[PDB]
Amino acid sequence: MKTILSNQTVDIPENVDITLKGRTVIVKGPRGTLRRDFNHINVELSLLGKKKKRLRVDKWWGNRKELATVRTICSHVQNMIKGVTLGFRYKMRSVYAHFPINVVIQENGSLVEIRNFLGEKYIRRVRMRPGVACSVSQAQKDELILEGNDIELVSNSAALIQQATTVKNKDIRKFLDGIYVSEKGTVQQA
Amino acid sequence: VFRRFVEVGRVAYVSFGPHAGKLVAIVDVIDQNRALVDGPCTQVRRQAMPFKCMQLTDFILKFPHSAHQKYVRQAWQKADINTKWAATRWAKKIEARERKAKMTDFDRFKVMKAKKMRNRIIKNEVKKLQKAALLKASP
Amino acid sequence: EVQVLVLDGRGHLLGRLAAIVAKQVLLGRKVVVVRCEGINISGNFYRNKLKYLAFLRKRMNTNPSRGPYHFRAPSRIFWRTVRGMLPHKTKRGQAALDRLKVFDGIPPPYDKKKRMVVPAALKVVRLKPTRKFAYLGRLAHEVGWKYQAVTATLEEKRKEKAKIHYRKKKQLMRLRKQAEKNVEKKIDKYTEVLKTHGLLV
Amino acid sequence: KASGTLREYKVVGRCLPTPKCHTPPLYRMRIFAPNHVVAKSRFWYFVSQLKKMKKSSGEIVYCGQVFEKSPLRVKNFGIWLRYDSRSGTHNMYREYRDLTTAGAVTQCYRDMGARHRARAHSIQIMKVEEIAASKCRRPAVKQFHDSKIKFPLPHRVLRRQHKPRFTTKRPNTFF
Amino acid sequence: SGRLWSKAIFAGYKRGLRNQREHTALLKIEGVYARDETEFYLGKRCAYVYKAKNNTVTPGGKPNKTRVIWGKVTRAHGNSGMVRAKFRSNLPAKAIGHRIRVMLYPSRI
Amino acid sequence: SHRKFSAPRHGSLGFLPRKRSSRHRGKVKSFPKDDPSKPVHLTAFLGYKAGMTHIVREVDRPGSKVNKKEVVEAVTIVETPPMVVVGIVGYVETPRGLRTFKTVFAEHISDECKRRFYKNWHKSKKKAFTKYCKKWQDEDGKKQLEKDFSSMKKYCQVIRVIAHTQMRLLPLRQKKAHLMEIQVNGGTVAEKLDWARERLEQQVPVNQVFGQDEMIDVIGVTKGKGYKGVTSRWHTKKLPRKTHRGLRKVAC
RNA sequence: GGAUGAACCGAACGCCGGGUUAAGGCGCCCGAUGCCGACGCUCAUCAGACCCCAGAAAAGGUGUUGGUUGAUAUAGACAGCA
RNA sequence: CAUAGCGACGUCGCUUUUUGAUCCUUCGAUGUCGGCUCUUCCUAUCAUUGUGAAGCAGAAUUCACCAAGCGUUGGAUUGUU
RNA sequence: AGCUACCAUCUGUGGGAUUAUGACUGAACGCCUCUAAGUCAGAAUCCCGCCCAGGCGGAACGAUACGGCAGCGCCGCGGAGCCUCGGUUGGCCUCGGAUAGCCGGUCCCCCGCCGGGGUCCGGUGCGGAGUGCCCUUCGUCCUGGGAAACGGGGCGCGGCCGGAGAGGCGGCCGCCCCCUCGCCCGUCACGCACCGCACGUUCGUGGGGAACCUGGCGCUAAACCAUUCGUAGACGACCUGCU
Ligand SMILES: [Mg+2]
Ligand SMILES: [Mg+2]
Ligand SMILES: [Mg+2]
Ligand SMILES: [Mg+2]
Ligand SMILES: [Mg+2]
Ligand SMILES: [Mg+2]
Ligand SMILES: [Mg+2]
Ligand SMILES: [Mg+2]
Ligand SMILES: [Mg+2]
Ligand SMILES: [Mg+2]
Ligand SMILES: [Mg+2]
Ligand SMILES: [Mg+2]
Ligand SMILES: [Mg+2]
Ligand SMILES: [Mg+2]
Ligand SMILES: [Mg+2]
Ligand SMILES: [Mg+2]
Ligand SMILES: [Mg+2]
Ligand SMILES: [Mg+2]
Ligand SMILES: [Mg+2]
Ligand SMILES: [Mg+2]
C-alpha cells in the first residue's frame, strides 16, 4: 500500500518568519537565525499563510517507512521555532560521593574543565559546539547551564560532558558519580 | 512545488502507445498506475491507459468523475482546447518537429541557403555591436 | 563515431558506466573519462568500503609483489573495472583497453572541451531516490588514495576559470539576442523560411 | 497452470447419459483461463473435486467466453480464493480495482505470485464478485474512493535511456 | 565532394558462444539502433577498404595501394539495429572495429 | 599441524628488499611538513662519519637514579663543512603527485661541484654549464630568468635548493662533491624564493641549519658486508653439530 | 546449453549454402531485449541470482508486506495531560 | 528467584584438530612416528586494546561482544604426540 | 687494525574513516525509543603516514662529437625523389550543478567598472533546445538587385597577453601587400559531354627510415674498456683518483 498523501501542517508565530529555498529552511527570529536543510528527504514544502504563516509539508506515494519522516521534519521545524524564540536551556547536576567535582568555565563558555572527577589528577577538557554557551549557575550548589539556539547542538554538547564523566572498571550501580542532565528547560520562560 | 496534478478533467498528452501524439482527458483513476482516459474530440474512445505514457498539460476540465462521453465531449467543445492547444508553444514545437522530419532534400537545400545568409548578417551585426561596445574607456 | 568521446563521471554508477564504455572501446571508438572521483556506487558507503577491503586482502601469499595490483586512484579503479568487462588477455582486448583513457579531475587536454554524459548510467535515473550510495572519491581517500585534497583545490581553480568563460559566453549570447532584434527588417525573409521548415520555432 | 491475459469462460458440462439417469443435471462454472483449452481442462478438475465426475464419464455442452457487462465502468472486485502455502492451505479475500472481471483475476494471480510466491497451479479462485465502494475493506482500494482525488507524478524516471545513448544535457525529472 | 556512404562498424562474425560462422558477419551502422530502421539498409551493398604494401589495379584509375573487399547486407541481427552481411571472401579478423562503407548502390527508392 | 611452541619471527618485514642500495648518498625521502608561520629555515644537511668517542656529562633527569650524577655516553663525530648552494628547484602539486616544474642554476659553479656530472673528470674537457652560465650576463637570459622566478612564484608549492659539499676541505681521497636537494621551509613561496635567491653562491654553515641539544634524524647506507649466510643475514637459530648437510642453514 | 564436468536438459553425427527451432539465454566479456516491457516484493556492517549442483536446521523479529480470527470505537476509541 | 551463572527429560545443527565406515586415486614405490628449525593461516580469545552484564562494595573472578595486531616460556621423567 | 656479542653502546613514530559499545534529536506508534531520515564519542581492528624497493611510468636541467673534411642540430615545407607503416573520409573553443526542481532576463543593495543577494519579467515535456548548433565544396565569363563596404586573405613581418594538472594551445596589437573577390537571389555561357558502372571525395604537405642537391644560423662532447681506489665486492656491479 502506498498512501496518496500524508500532509502535516505546523503553525509559525508572527514574530518569526520562515523563508524556504528548495528543501532548506531558514528561520529568522528574535533570538537568532537557524538554517537546516532536508535534501535527504523527498518532501514538498509549502507556505500557506500570507496572514498567519501556516507551513505545510507533503509526501506523495510513500510507504510506511517514509511517512514517518513527515512528522520528523515537523518536529524539527517546531524545534527551530522554539529555539529562535525561547532557546533551549539544559541543567546538568554534578553528583559525587567523596571527591567533589570541580568545574571551571573557560572563555565565552565554549570550553569546560573538569578537575577532580573521582579524585584522579587527569584534567578533562570538553569543547562545546559553536553557538552553545555553558556556564556555572548561581542558582544551586552544583548546576551547569547550557544555553543555545539548536536543541541538536545543546543536547549533544551536554551529552558529551556526561559521557566524559564515565566510571570505568567499577560497579556503575554503586558508583553514582558523574554529571547528569536534570531537566530540559527553556530561556525567557515565555 | 508541483503545479500539474493527476485529477479528473486534467488534459494529458500521449507521448507513446497506440495513440501517440494525441490529446486526452482523464475521467477516473485506478490502481495508482492507470486511469480511465477518454478524449472524444481527438478521436480516442474511452479506455484504460497507464501514466507512463501521460504528460500532464496545463488544462483541466470541469465535469464529475465517471461521467459519460457526452458530457466530456461537451466539456471539451465548450471552452474548447483544440484552438487553445495549437496556440501554445508545446504544440508548435511538436508541429515544427514534424515538418522538420519530413523536410525534403530540395527543402534541405533551400534552408541551408537561408541559414547561410541569415547567420552571416547576424554575425556581422554582432561584430558591429562588439566594436560599438568597444568604445569604453572609463576609470 | 570516429571522434574521441569524452564522458564526465559525475553522478554515474560504476558498473552501469563501465559496461557501456567497454562496448564502445571494442567498437574502435576512443573513449576518455574524466572526473572519475565523481562516480557513484550503489549501496551505502560502509558496505562498499567493506567490499574493497575484502578485495585488498586478496593477495598472493607466496609473493604479494606478484599478487593482484590493488589500485587506489579513482581513475585506476574505474580502469580496472572496465578491464574485467573486456577480454584483456587477448590482443584485441589490449587494443580495446588502449583506446580507453581515464583521468581524475579534468586535465587541460579536456578542460576546454564539452563533456558527454550517458543517461542510461546516471545515478539520478537508475537509482531510487531513497537508496544509499557512496562516492568513489571518498572511498578512494579512505582506502589509500593520496590526492583527494589536491584534486579538490585544483578542481576549485577549474570551476572559477570555467565560470568566467561561461559568463563571457552569456554576454555573447545576450549580445546576439539583442543583435537579432536590430537586424529584423532584412532577416525576416530567411527566418520565415525556417518557420515553414521546422527550424527556429 | 500458466498465465498471460486471462479470460472469463462460461463452461457448462454434465455426466454422460446412463440408464439410471437419462438426463443427469447440468452444471455451470466460471473458469478463468488464458484460452478455452485450459478452461475445459480446469472445469473437469473442478467438477471432480466437487461431484463424482470424470472427463471420460461426462461431456461439456458449452464453453463460451464471458464478455464484461460494463468494461467502461470502474468497479472494485472482491475475490475469495484458497491456495497452498509451503506449510498449509489458507483462504484469502483480496480486493482489486479493474475495469473487467478477467483483469481483476489477472491482477490477483500477479499479486499472489509476487507477495506469497504462489504459482497458478496452487491458487484456487472460488468466487469473484463486484462490490460497492462502502463495503470494501482494503485501505489500498479505499484511498481511491475520493470524488475530489488529486495527486501529482513526483519523480518521472527517464525511460528512453538509450535514445540517445550519449548526450550533453542531464535529464530533467520535475514536470 | 561528399562522404556518399553510410558509416558502419565491423563488430564481428555471426557466432554462438563457442562457435564462429566466419562466412557471415555482423555490422553496426552509425545512427541505426532499432530493428525497424534497418529496412532501408536491407539489400544495400557494403565494402571494406584497406591498404597494403604492393600496388594493385584500380578500375578506371592509376594503380595504387588501395584494396577493397565487396559484399552486401542480407538481414538485420537482433533488435538493436545490428545487421548481417555476406562478402565475396570472409572478412579478415584484423578489420574488427574499423570503418565499413554502405554504398547505397541497390537503391529501392 | 601447528608448531609446538609459538615464537616471534626472525627479522623485520619492513626492510624486505634486502638488496644493495641503489644510491650511495642516501636520499631524504621525507622533508618536514612546511607551515607558513615559521620563518625561513633549511631542513637537511650533509656530513661525513669521522668516527666515534665518548664523553662525560651531568644528567638533569629528575626522579632517575642518574639525576645530578656523572655518566659516560658514546658520541659520534660527523664532519660538516659549510655547503654551497648552486641551484633552485620548485615543485608543482599534480593530481599524480609532484613533478619538477623548472630548475634555475647559478653562475660560477665550483670545479669540485662540476665533477659530479662527469664520470671521467680526467678525460673530459670540463664543458658542463659553460653555455648555460652565458645567459647570466646577456639581455635575453636575465630577462628569461626573471620569468622563471615569477612562474615558480605563482605556480610551485615547494622550492628546494641544490648544495654541494666542499670536498677540498676534507682529507678524503675523493675530490668529487656531493649534490643534494634541500627543501626550504617556513614561509610563503615568494619569501622563500627571495631568501633562496640571496643565498645563491653562498656558504651555509651548520649553525644556520641546526642548533644545540635538539633531536634530528640520520639518513645513510649501512656498512657493506657482502654475501652472508642466513645465520648472520637473519639471525636464525643454528642447527646442531650432528647435522649432515651443515648447521648454518634453515631447516624448513 | 549447465562457466568448467563420461551419466543432466535438448538433440545424436557423410561434406556444404539458405531459413527455422529445441534446451537455454539476450548489461560486458559474449550472439541476442540499446522493449519509453507489465505487476508487485526486497536493503543485507557475511543480501540474492535457477534440475543434477556443489553448502544449512530447529528456533526468534514491534524490519516490512499480505491474509485469518477475535475484540474495542461519535452510547466516543487508543495514546498523552490529574 | 527458570533463564546472574547452570540446563534434566527431549530436540535441531555445526567441525573434520579423534576414532570409526567405505575402497575412488597411488602396488613398473608420493619415504611411513616423534623431536629440532622455520614460515604462514584460522578463531571456537589464554593474556593484552575498547565495551555490556553479574548474587560486580573494593580487590579477585565469571559470562558476552568488536577483535587473531602482538604474545603464549625455561626444566625432571619417558622415543613418545 | 678488521670482524664481532642485550657479552658493550644507540634508536624505534603521527593521522583518518570507523567495529563493538555508550549516547543526541526524532518519528514510526498525537507516549517512549541510539534509527527509520539525520548527528556525536569510540579502539592493540582496518587504511594511510614514517620506513623499505622503485613500472615496458612520467618530470626538470647540463653537455652534446674536426682541426680537419666532419659529423651533427636548428631554421626553408626548399626542390627532386627511394623504401616502409597504415588508419581515416566536416567541426563544436569547456559553467556549476539539483532532480519533491530548474533555466534565462531585468530593477534596488552591498562586494572592487564587475560578481553575488532580494523585487520583477519570461520559459520549463528542456527551443538562449546536443532530437542541438556552426561551416557546408562544381569552378569560372557577361550580368543586375540586395549583404556589406569600422571587409576579407596572407604557411607576409615585429610585438603583447592569457594558459603549468599533461601548460605544445588560444587570443590580441602595430606595419606591409592583394581583391574590392568571395554571402544570397537573378542574367549570360563555357569547361573532355571521356558515351551506366567499383577502390571516387578527407585529414594530408600523414607517420617512420636511409639518401641527392640546395641557402642561412650555428656546436666542437661524452660514455665504456684499461688503470687506480676500497666507504664495495663470488664474478659482475658500486664508491673513487689520474700536469
Ligand atoms: Mg573490580
Ligand atoms: Mg599456539
Ligand atoms: Mg649423520
Ligand atoms: Mg556444453
Ligand atoms: Mg555450474
Ligand atoms: Mg546453419
Ligand atoms: Mg551466458
Ligand atoms: Mg552483443
Ligand atoms: Mg579402489
Ligand atoms: Mg609411480
Ligand atoms: Mg620417488
Ligand atoms: Mg616426493
Ligand atoms: Mg570470533
Ligand atoms: Mg605480523
Ligand atoms: Mg633436558
Ligand atoms: Mg632425569
Ligand atoms: Mg645486545
Ligand atoms: Mg516526544
Ligand atoms: Mg548503534
Ligand atoms: Mg566520529
**DSSP collapsed to 3 states, chain C:** CCCCEEEECCCEEHHHHHHHHHHHHHCCCCEEEECHHHEEEECCHHHHHHHHHHHHHCCCCCCHHHCCCCCCCHHHHHHHHHHHHCCCCCHHHHHHHHCEEECCCCCHHHHCCCCEECHHHEHHHHCCCCCCEEEHHHHHHHHCCCCHHHHHHHHHHHHHHHHHHHHHHHHHHHHHHHHHHHCCCCCHHHHHHHHHCCCCC
Identify the CA nearest to E69 among candidates E97, E106, E100, E41. E100
Question: What DSSP letter does each residue of F15-29 carry, written as one string?
Answer: T------S-SS----
Residues of C in Cβ contact (< 8 Å) with B97: 198
Q: Which residue has the cell 636537494?
A: F181
- Residue B115 to residue E63: CA distance in whole angstroms: 42
Task: Assess contact for D28 and D12: CB atoms under 8 A.
Answer: yes
| Residue E60 per-residue DSSP state | T
Which residue has cell 559568463? C167
Among all strands, which nt has the closest C1' to A63 (CA)?
A: G64
> What's the CA gap between D75 and D129, in Å, rounded?
10
Q: Is F96 on the interface with C (CB under 8 A)?
A: yes
Cis bond upstream, residue D152 (ω within 30): no
Task: Give me the E residues in range 49-78 that sit within 7 A (CB) of strand G.
Answer: 74-75, 77-78
Residues of chain D neighbouring C114 (CB-CB closer than 8 A): 168
CB burial of D119-155 (b: ≥16 within 10 Å; e: otherwise) equals ebebbbbeebeeeeeeebeeebbebbeeeebebbbbe
Report CA E13 to chain centroid distance, whole Å: 11
Task: Looking at chain F, list the stretches that DSSP marks H as alpha helix, in order from N- to C-terminal side.
Answer: 111-114, 139-155, 189-198, 230-233
CA A36 to chain centre: 13
Number of Cβ within 10 Å of residue A128's Cβ equals 23
DSSP states of F200-240: TT-EE-GGGT--SS-------------S--HHHHS-PPPPP
The minimal CB distance from D151 to the residues A1, A4, A42 is found for A4
F91 within 8 A of F156, measured Cβ to Cβ: yes
Q: Which helix (H) or strand (E) holds F85?
A: strand F83-94
Tell me, what amino acid is at E78? Answer: G
- Secondary structure element (H or E) that encloses residue A178, with its range: strand A178-186
**Neighbour tally for D14: CB within 10 Å:** 19
CB contact under 8 A, F93 and C104: no
End-to-end CA distance of chain A: 43
CA distance A134 to chain B (A): 41
Using the CA of C47, give the nucleotide whose C1' is nearest: G45
To which residue does cell 464529475 refer? B64
Contact A84, A31 (CB under 8 A): yes
Cβ atoms A81, A12 nearer than 8 A: yes
Instruction: Work out the minimum CA distance from F54 to partner chain C, whole angstroms.
Output: 44
Q: Tell me if residue A85 falls in helix, strand or coil.
A: helix
CA dist list (Å): F69 to A32, F64, F213:
64, 10, 19
CA C42 to chain centre: 17
Ligand 11 center to F226 CA (angstroms): 38
What value does the CA radius of gyration of chain A take, rounded to a whole number of Å?
Answer: 21
Instruction: Please identify which residue in the block is written with the cell numbers 525561547.
Output: A86
CA separation for the pair D126, C157 (Å, rounded) = 71
Kindly state the cell numbers that stand for D163. Answer: 535514445
Please name every residue paired with E29 in a beta bridge, in sequence order, or none if there are none: E8
Cα of A87 to ligand 18 centre, how many Å?
A: 17
Q: How far is CA D168 from the centre of its chain?
A: 46
Measure the CA–CA gap between F236 and F239, rounded to whole angstroms. 9
Cell 653562475 locates to: F107
Whether chain C has a CB inside 8 Å of the CB on D171: the answer is: yes
Question: What dihedral do alpha carbons A60, A65, A66, A69 form, nearest 10°?
Answer: 140
Q: How far apart are CA E66 and CA E72, in angstroms?
A: 20
Cα E18 to averaged position of ligand 4 atoms, centre (Å): 9
**D58 Cβ contact partners less than 8 Å away, ≥ 6 residues apart:** D13, D14, D15, D16, D24, D44, D47
Closest CA to D44 of D33, D60, D23: D60
Taking alpha carbons only, the member of D138, D172, D142 closest to residue D156 is D172
C-alpha cell at A142: 552544583
- Taking a C-beta distance cutoff of 8 angstroms, is the pair F86, F180 a contact? no
Q: Which three cell numbers stand for residue E68?
A: 577493397
Across all strands, nucleotide nearest A169 (CA–C1'): H56
The SS3 assignment for E50 reads strand
DSSP three-state, residue D7: strand
Contact A66 C130 (CB under 8 A): yes
Q: How far is the CA of F248 from the C1' of H72 (A)?
A: 28
Residues for chain B: how many in total? Answer: 139
| D159 vs D171: CA distance, rounded Å | 10
DSSP state of D21: B
D163 lies within 8 A of chain C by CB: no
Interatomic CA distance for residues F9 and F6, integer angstroms = 9
F103 CB neighbours strand I below 7 A: yes
* Strand order across the beta sheet in which D124-131 lies: D88-98, D75-85, D124-131
Place of cell 593530481: F95
Helical (H) or strand (E) element with B56:
strand B54-60
Decide: F164 and F114 in contact? Cβ < 8 Å. no
∠ at Cα C168 (C162, C171), nearest 5°? Answer: 145
Q: Is D3 helix (H, G, I), strand (E, B) or coil?
A: coil
Q: Please, are residues A20 and A77 in contact by the beta-carbon 8 Å criterion?
A: no
Query: What single-letter amino acid sits at D155?
Result: H
The single residue listed with the C-alpha cell 561584430 is: B127
Tell me the nearest-neighbour CA distance from D137 into chain B, angstroms.
Answer: 15
> How many residues in total does chain E contain?
109
User: Is E53:E65 a contact under the CB 8 Å cutoff?
Assistant: yes
Amino acid code (one letter) for D8: E
**Measured between CB atoms, does D163 come within 8 Å of chain E?**
yes
Judging contact as 3 or more Cβ pairs under 8 Å, the answer for B and E is no
B67 shares contact with chain D (CB less than 8 Å): no
d(C-alpha D145, C-alpha D140), whole Å: 10
> Are the C-beta atoms of D3 and D33 separated by less than 8 Å?
no
Distance of C1' in H59 from CA in A121, Å: 22
* Whether F249 contacts F233, CB under 8 Å: no
State the Cα–Cα distance between residues E60 and E41, nearest whole angstrom.
28
Contacts of E33 in chain D (CB under 8 A): 162-163, 165
**F165 near F186, Cβ under 8 Å?**
no
Which residue from C minimizes the CA distance to D155?
C129
Output the distance from F11 CA to H30 C1' rounded to whole Å: 34
**What's the rounded Cα separation, in Å, for the pair F166 and F112?**
7
CA distance B61 to chain A (A): 22
Three-state DSSP class for D73? coil
Measured at the CA of F138, the angle between CA F132 and CA F139, to 5 degrees, comes to: 130
Burial A38-59 (b: 16+ CB within 10 A, else e): beebbbbbeeeeeeebebebbb
HSE-up of residue F77 (Cα within 13 Å, Cβ side): 6
The closest nt to C144, taking CA to C1', is I48
For B40, the grid coordinates are 472524444
Spatial distance between the Cα atoms of A47 and A88, rounded to a whole number of angstroms: 26
* Three-state secondary-structure class, residue D80: strand
CA C183 to chain B, closest CA, distance in angstroms equals 7
Which is nearest to A149 in space by CA: A165, A130, A163, A167? A130
Nucleic strand I contact set for C 3-22 (CB, < 7 Å): 3, 10-11
Q: How near does any CA of chain F get to the CA of C140, in Å?
A: 13
Rounded to whole angstroms, how far apart are CA atoms C75 and B81?
54
Q: Is B2 on the interface with A (CB under 8 A)?
A: yes
Please state, in angstroms and rounded to a whole number, the distance separating the CA atoms of residues B124 and B118: 10
Residue C149 CA to residue C37 CA, distance in Å, equals 12
Measured between CB atoms, does D154 come within 8 Å of chain A?
yes
Q: Look at the block and give the residue holding cell 509451503.
A: D86
E96 touches strand G (CB under 7 A): no
Q: What is d(CA D128, CA D80) in angstroms, rounded to the nearest whole number?
A: 6
- Segment A141-146 long-range contacts (CB within 8 Å, at least 24 positions apart): A142/A93, A142/A94, A142/A95, A142/A101, A143/A91, A143/A92, A143/A93, A143/A182, A144/A91, A144/A92, A144/A94, A144/A103, A144/A112, A144/A179, A145/A89, A145/A90, A145/A91, A146/A88, A146/A89, A146/A90, A146/A92
Chain A residues whose beta carbon lies within 8 Å of the beta carbon of residue C124: none
Which experimental method was this entry solved with? Answer: cryo-EM
Please say whether the beta carbons of A20 and B1 come within 8 A: no
Query: What is the identity of the amino acid at D22?
Result: H
CB of C52 within 8 A of CB of C74? no
Q: B103 vs C194: CB contact, 8 Å cut-off? A: no
For chain E, how many helices (H) and strands (E)?
0, 6
F113: helix, strand or coil: helix
The answer to whether E28 and E81 have CB atoms below 8 angstroms apart is: yes
**Residue found under cell 579478423:** E93
Touch test F–A: 3 Cβ pairs or more under 8 Å: no
Q: Report CA(A170)–ligand 1 centroid distance (Å).
A: 6
For chain A, list the contacting chains (3+ Cβ pairs, <8 Å). B, C, D
E residues 39-98 lying closer than 8 A (beta carbon) to D: none
C63 inside 8 A of chain B by CB: no
Q: Is the CB of D115 under 7 A from strand G?
A: yes
The grid cell for B35 is: 486511469
Minimum CA–CA partner of F96 in chain C: C147
SS3 of residue E93 by DSSP: helix
Chains that touch C (3 or more CB pairs under 8 A): A, B, D, E, F
Angle of CA points A53, A56, A62, to nearest 5°: 175
> Among candidates E108, E98, E106, E103, which has minimal Cα distance to E9?
E98
Structural resolution in Å: 3.6
Residue B84 in 3-state DSSP? helix
* Pair C45, C73: CB distance under 8 Å: no
Nearest-angstrom CA–CA distance, F165 and F170: 9
The closest alpha carbon to A10, from A40, A53, A43, A51, belongs to: A53
Residue whose CA is minimally distant from I10 C1': F74
CA distance D133 to D146: 10
Q: In angstroms, what CA-CA distances link D133 with D96, D147, F87? A: 11, 12, 91
Q: Could you tell me which residues come within 8 angstroms of residue C61 by beta carbon, excluding any fewer than 6 positions away?
A: none
Q: Contact at 8 Å (CB) between C12 and C38? A: yes
Q: What residues pair up with E82 in beta bridges, in sequence order? A: E77
**C-alpha cell recorded at residue B90:** 508545446
- Protein-to-nucleotide distance from the CA of A67 to the C1' of G79, whole angstroms: 19
Terminus-to-terminus CA distance in chain F, angstroms? Answer: 14
Cβ-Cβ contacts under 8 Å, C129 against chain A: 42
Nucleotides of I under 7 A from a protein CB: 3-4, 6, 9-10, 16-19, 22-29, 36-41, 46-54, 57-64, 84-102, 104-106, 113-116, 118, 123-138, 146-152, 163-168, 183-185, 197-201, 220-226, 229, 231-234, 237-243
Cβ neighbours of residue D100 under 8 Å, at least 6 residues apart? D68, D71
Q: How far apart are the C-alpha atoms of A85 and E1, rounded to whole Å?
A: 77
Residues D171, D162: contact at Cβ < 8 Å?
Answer: no
Identify the residues numbered 27 to 86 in chain E whose C-beta atom is closer than 7 Å to any atom of strand I.
47, 49-53, 56-61, 64, 66-68, 70
